[PDB]
Design a protein around this nucleic acid. Sequence first.
DNA 1: ATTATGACGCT
DNA 2: AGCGTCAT
Length: 430
Amino acid sequence: GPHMATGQDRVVALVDMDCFFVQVEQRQNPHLRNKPCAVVQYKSWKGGGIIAVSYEARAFGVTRSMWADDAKKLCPDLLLAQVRESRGKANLTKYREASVEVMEIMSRFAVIERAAIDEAYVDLTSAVQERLQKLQGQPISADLLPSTYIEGLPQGPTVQKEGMRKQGLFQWLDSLQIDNLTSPDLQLTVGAVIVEEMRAAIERETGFQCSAGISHNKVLAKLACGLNKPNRQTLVSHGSVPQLFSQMPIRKIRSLGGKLGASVIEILGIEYMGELTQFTESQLQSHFGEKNGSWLYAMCRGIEHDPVKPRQLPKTIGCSKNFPGKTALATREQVQWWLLQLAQELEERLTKDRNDNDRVATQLVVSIRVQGDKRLSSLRRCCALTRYDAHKMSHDAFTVIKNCNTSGIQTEWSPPLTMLFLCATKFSAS
DNA sequence: ATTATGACGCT
DNA sequence: AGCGTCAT
Ligand SMILES: Nc1ncnc2c1ncn2[C@H]1C[C@H](O)[C@@H](COP(=O)(O)OP(=O)(O)OP(=O)(O)O)O1
Ligand SMILES: [Ca+2]
Ligand SMILES: [Mg+2]
């Protein structure tokens, strides 16, 4: 009753650029705009691996993790843009710089947590308070929410998509004007007005469109964002949670898409997030651990307390290459040459990072995969990162991994290496 | 041969 | 510290 927390204290958004690498390439090459197109890395093996897909191409069934040759079977007119190759490997610099464009615009509106290259959480609580102070009791016009969906509406007593969107929005605003909603609902609504403004500024100033979710915490905002894509935003209110979760597969909630979610389904014999409400907190903790159990108990009721962390920059800078199948590295010369290529890219990115962001990395992490090992990483070793020098970093990485070579012949490397990874970590201000 | 990243938890 | 999990 009067003491039960409802997790309605914050306004949180999740902004997700639509098919981001595709939009970067379409901005650069207008011939790709408004077409089925995809971004591919490499080309020799089966036409290259697809890593991003325009919504027009998705309509044909093109997905990521698809070979370009196969996507062409589904969409013969599919256009492709290739990721730049430098030093013999894919180089993602263009997309990192475009990401910085968008992150810097978002930072003008509120504190952001960079969640991925194309994804940021936004803590809008304070901005909403300010905007409400400016509004001074003035109602919110539907014109301020031209791309907003209210999840769960319309309901109760038009066959077009936009018509439904407007009907639900009208019902929501009508009940806010009449005072049949809560103060959290108004806070979320103002949050959505701000997110409309943020998304308009991103598109105006970069050309890039995005979707967004607005709710009371990060998990609901993330879930909301995916409900109406592309180029739309979705408000998930606290009151919408019971119906939304009643048919929501557990795997759709962030962090439950893998082994833990599968175990939740198997151990409890449930399918949907809402079914979790029937277990006590102690029950969930007994199956899934103290932390996971408390998190699940609150989350299935729409409550989550994870803060939007004030972090616009990545915490690590890494360079990685797989050497699949027959291309696995089998000589020492090979391993050293590729460590050097990775280390040269890393040095370049680190020097740029130091100049832009007033920080220096102090730890170098070296990871490898050996042929046959099912795990993504077979071995990880750290050493001190004391100079931004590619030859030193590559020599140090070799030193930390050289004892993995079983081969009795110094010149040969066995088992062959199927992945090399160098990562700079533990930044300090400079 | 579903690549190149990136964050974070466990012990 | 090194490994595992989850996601983009
Ligand atoms: N598995 C991956 N491997 C490599 N790059 C990826 C991978 N997943 C995503 N990316 C890249 C390309 C995407 O443009 C960008 C953002 O990822 P993601 O949000 O999942 O999809 P998306 O932005 O391409 O489409 P959507 O609009 O549905 O979000 O990061
Ligand atoms: Ca995206
Ligand atoms: Mg994303």
